[PDB]
Design a protein around this ligand. Structure first.
Ligand SMILES: Nc1ncnc2c1ncn2[C@@H]1O[C@H](COP(=O)(O)OP(=O)(O)O)[C@@H](O)[C@H]1O
Ligand SMILES: [Mg+2]
Lengths: 469, 127, 54, 465, 114
């Protein structure tokens, strides 16, 4: 059923039909272009007039171009053949290696599973990072969030969990990149050929990739995250494997819908977002779940705008996350890397019936001596360090060794540092922190714990500093 | 009286409650508000009124007209929108402190911040 | 004598450091209250102007 | 008659044919169980008015039938309204039968003219020693009552009702502006158990107007007008000296800025209405002293976010003439009533209003109560005996003065067992004129705790030991 | 290049001693003057005379205070800020530097309050 274009303002194109009206959330093909331009229906306006949003640019559009209809939403190709390929929002391959040849096509708009299709079991997934496994443990099949501002390490910490977790994992893996720099989608395609995860010669790859970056029109940065978790829904449902899912960034799903909003005819809410902010967020975040047919681990990076966690876009994602890892610029400007805030990160399995009673009284023993270190800094600013008593000159020196011991040299940050990549196991992280608290290392300076692995290297680094006096 | 050779004196009390009455008629006409939800032409309201208080020359009769408006500030705020639109019109100030009125000095005139520019040359040589 | 001379001047010099820190704490309370009202006023105009032009 | 065209929330639009009613009238919807009164607020053209509802709006069909009273909301008024409870439209809400009276009055009424005002200030005496000496009450003025729950506020309400009906002979009205149902039930039963309201005869001393909190935002703004019509009957028709209690005044302001935003108007500064200075003007100018009688008002004031320069507690402050503050730090000291003597101010405290005898007595009391406030810190930090012998009497006298401000009330005769004392004005000035001069200093402290005049003080020193 | 290498060097020393005084006002207001160093009781004691030496009695303001209007040349406002930044006048109070013209009247005022 053909239709004409009657208005173009920005990225919002109005299309008047005559005899057959397509429903909301469909695909319309603009005839007359050399490229493929797909329009997605968003509203009805009466007298057979819809109002659409454009997936590509709108330059060179004229009033009267005949527009076809599909009868179905954006059906991307899906299957086992899409592994090791980069694809577009509408399913075209942009790796320039040929057509994706598969048998299953699947729409990106689908429902959420019901209440009696949820799973209830909890586990612990070990990573190897000392701050994460001690104070805020992650979980298999659980949604994980990476907060923090701009330029603190959200892309590197999400590059670390592809390094550790994704090669030791059995099943497949999906990376959706939404609204980030087009350079950094090339340092992933060239750090996954030389590690053999993407293979360009046969059929043994384990990673798919979906990319819509920050050069796209704002109608195309808000349907890419729905295209990421459509491929990752095929593996969980039509197959049975354990899937991972990495999403960076996800603040650019909310922001890209706050730009097409005022031309669709909506009054703005608080500080500038759309009125339907917490409904379409909660419509995407209810498909990333662990059901009774599979399990989806999911790590997500969440940009916090100008270091304010009370902004309405990051402060409504908290209801959808089990483990939050709040990064901070006040730690990163000390040199403590990864800058994870210990007094602001939580988990749902910090529970002495799940992690055992020995891990539990160590975690709260670390936060209690760090929070009591905070209230002591208010005295040193007026009194000084030396005028304190000898009893709280010790709880400072125990706290400063706990701050520095949490910082671990990462593997993918070798070109920044030159240091080597360490991976401390779970049983050693607890035993390292019992001995600083009990007082078994009061004879070492603070520098012996900076950027080390296990506690064994904390004394080997202590003697090597001594001899150069 | 000014145009017919006589001298007058007028005390507006107060010009603060006039500007909250012009604000009401403006926003009820759907006009764009500005600082402190005021309309854009509050300066036209008080300048076109306090420009009339003048002294004619001897060829026009020789009368005069003196004005003494009153502004109320909220907790010593002499840096707000309305008490700066009227400092930048009138030829001086008289300041009344609320923390010298409590100490028993009455009238609580701040002698440090009270100035009168043009009226210093016209006083009695005995004074 | 010197530990009495010192311990009395610690009493006075910690007293004027709480008068000057309470004199400073009222002047920042007025500026906090002017600025708290000015942000509710400012972001109210942006919603009204956004709806009127629509 | 008219017809309803549009129903949007708590705003109904009514289409008439011939008899277009003016603004501030009152319509009434036909076909419903309970009375639903609409108040006309705007003429929208083509014979259509814009009305704000006063109860629930659901169940209303487009195209119903609506009558017209031809007048504003008219309430049952009279002397037989004493001791009953009514809402904003005059209906009784305590299931004690319909109120029967002779005449009615309209709530939207103009101010008194300029040639009817009083030309002189005049002090209202209420009997309490701390009120009528340091922060006295002008006749006709507006009073602000600082303090909330747990300080002993609802006793001070119930006692100023009792004393004016004894020394002056004027009844009172209580207007609950958007008040809680749980706390508007306890005040009903606390007045029953103290005598000021009475279920058996016609010796009641108050009339209750309760517009409660779960009512539409148009019905919480007119309650302070309905509760001012009744207070105008006992001045214009009988010439009494009436009191008036509003609790509180912030829920009258805040309920105004939700009608002016449901009606589609651009808000002023921080969120209030454009008309914040006339709604406080076209209410509180009817509270005045005419040539027949007077109306005096005691109002509770809640300050939002501890900001004294917010426009809701700044519009109100230009109308008040005296403020009394209930400090909780005097309630843990044992003194009742818990009125702070240093942080209460009066505008009529002036040698050319109350005379020089009241002035130099009440001036010296607040000066001596400051010297004990400055000398109590040296005694707490350093010690006691280092200060002079001329200062030991000021420590002793100021503990006599701040216990001589206590007074047993007539509303508490059953509980604390003492006798309620009502002190006239000439005893309270005579009393404190002698405590300052060291005339009754050799008597101990507990002779002054909880007495009436200065005569009963020396009759209590004999009973000790 | 344009104003010279001697004008440019005295004018940047004045903006250096007035910025370091601005970073100590958060401490002098709380802990007083007796908590500074000994070399930082000289940045304060010199910036409180350069501040008063940037005052000048104008010519049109003769009818305000009754003081004479003073005018200085450009070559003499370079010499006034060298004999303060070096330490030539560390035996005069701050109020002797108040509302004068060139540097010669500052020493002709400190002899009055003797
Ligand atoms: N392992 C690390 N620890 C601490 N900082 C890092 C690490 N890796 C990178 N950074 C710092 O983080 C900054 C931003 O890195 P990146 O994660 O790519 O950006 P963003 O988090 O803003 O997406 C870089 O300037 C780099 O110095
Ligand atoms: Mg990034």
């Amino acid at each position: 059923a053909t239709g004409r274009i009657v208005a173009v303002i920005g990225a919002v194109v109005d299309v008047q039909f005559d005899e057959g009206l397509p429903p909301i959330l469909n695909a319309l093909e603009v005839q007359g272009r050399e490229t493929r331009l797909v329009l997605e229906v968003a509203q009805h306006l009466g007298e057979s007039t819809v109002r659409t949003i454009a997936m590509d640019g709108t330059e060179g559009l004229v009033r009267g171009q005949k527009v076809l209809d599909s009868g179905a939403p954006i059906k991307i190709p899906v299957g086992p053949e899409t592994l090791g390929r980069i694809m577009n929002v509408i399913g075209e391959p942009i790796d320039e290696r040929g057509p994706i040849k598969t048998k299953q096509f699947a729409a990106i708009h689908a429902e959420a599973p019901e209440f009696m299709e949820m799973s209830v079991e909890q586990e612990i997934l070990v990573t190897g990072i000392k701050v994460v496994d001690l104070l805020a443990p992650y979980a298999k099949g659980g949604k994980i969030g990476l907060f923090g501002g701009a330029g603190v390490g959200k892309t590197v910490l999400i590059m670390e969990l592809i390094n550790n977790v994704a090669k030791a994992h059995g099943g497949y893996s999906v990376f959706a990149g939404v609204g980030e720099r087009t350079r950094e989608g090339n340092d992933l395609y060239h750090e996954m050929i030389e590690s053999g995860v993407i293979n360009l010669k046969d059929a043994t790859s384990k990673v798919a990739l979906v990319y819509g970056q920050m050069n796209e029109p704002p109608g195309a940065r808000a349907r890419v995250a729905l295209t990421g978790l459509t491929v990752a829904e095929y593996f969980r449902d039509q197959e049975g494997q354990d899937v991972l899912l990495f999403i960076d960034n996800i603040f650019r799903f909310t922001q890209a819908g706050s730009e097409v909003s005022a031309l669709l005819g909506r009054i703005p809410s608080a500080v500038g977002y759309q009125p339907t902010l917490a409904t379409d967020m909660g419509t995407m975040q209810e498909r990333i779940t662990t059901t009774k047919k599979g399990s989806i681990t999911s790590v997500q990076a969440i940009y916090v705008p100008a270091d304010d966690l009370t902004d309405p876009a990051p402060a409504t994602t908290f209801a959808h996350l089990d483990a939050t890892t709040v990064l901070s610029r006040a730690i990163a400007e000390l040199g403590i890397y990864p800058a994870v805030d210990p007094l602001d990160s939580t988990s749902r399995i910090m529970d002495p019936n799940i992690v055992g009673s020995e891990h539990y009284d160590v975690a709260r023993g670390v936060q209690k001596i760090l929070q009591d270190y905070k209230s002591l800094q208010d005295i040193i600013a007026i009194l000084g360090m030396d005028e304190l008593s000898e009893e709280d000159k010790l709880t400072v020196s125990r706290a400063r060794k706990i701050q520095r011991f949490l910082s671990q040299p990462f593997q993918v940050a070798e070109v920044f540092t030159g240091h080597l990549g360490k991976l401390v196991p779970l049983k050693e992280t607890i035993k390292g922190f019992q001995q600083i608290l009990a007082g078994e290392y009061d004879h070492l300076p603070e520098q012996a714990f900076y950027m080390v692995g296990p506690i064994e290297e904390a004394v080997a680094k202590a003697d090597k500093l001594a001899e150069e006096h | 009286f000014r145009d017919n050779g006589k001298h007058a004196l007028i005390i507006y009390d107060d010009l603060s409650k006039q500007a909250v009455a012009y604000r009401q008629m403006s926003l009820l006409l759907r006009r764009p508000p500005g600082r402190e939800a005021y309309p854009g032409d509050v300066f036209y309201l008080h300048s076109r009124l306090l420009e009339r208080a003048a002294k004619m020359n001897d060829a026009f009769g020789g009368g005069s007209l003196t004005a003494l408006p009153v502004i109320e500030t909220q907790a010593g705020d002499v840096s707000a929108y309305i008490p700066t639109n009227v400092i930048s019109i009138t030829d001086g100030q008289i300041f009344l402190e609320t923390e010298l009125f409590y100490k028993g000095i009455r009238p609580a005139i701040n002698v440090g911040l009270s100035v009168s520019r043009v009226g210093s040359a016209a006083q009695t040589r005995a004074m | 004598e010197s530990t009495t001379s010192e311990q009395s001047a610690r009493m006075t010099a910690m007293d004027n450091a709480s008068k000057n820190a309470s004199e400073m704490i009222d002047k920042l309370t007025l500026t906090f209250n002017r600025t708290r009202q000015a942000v509710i006023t400012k972001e109210l105009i942006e919603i009204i102007s956004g709806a009127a032009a629509l």
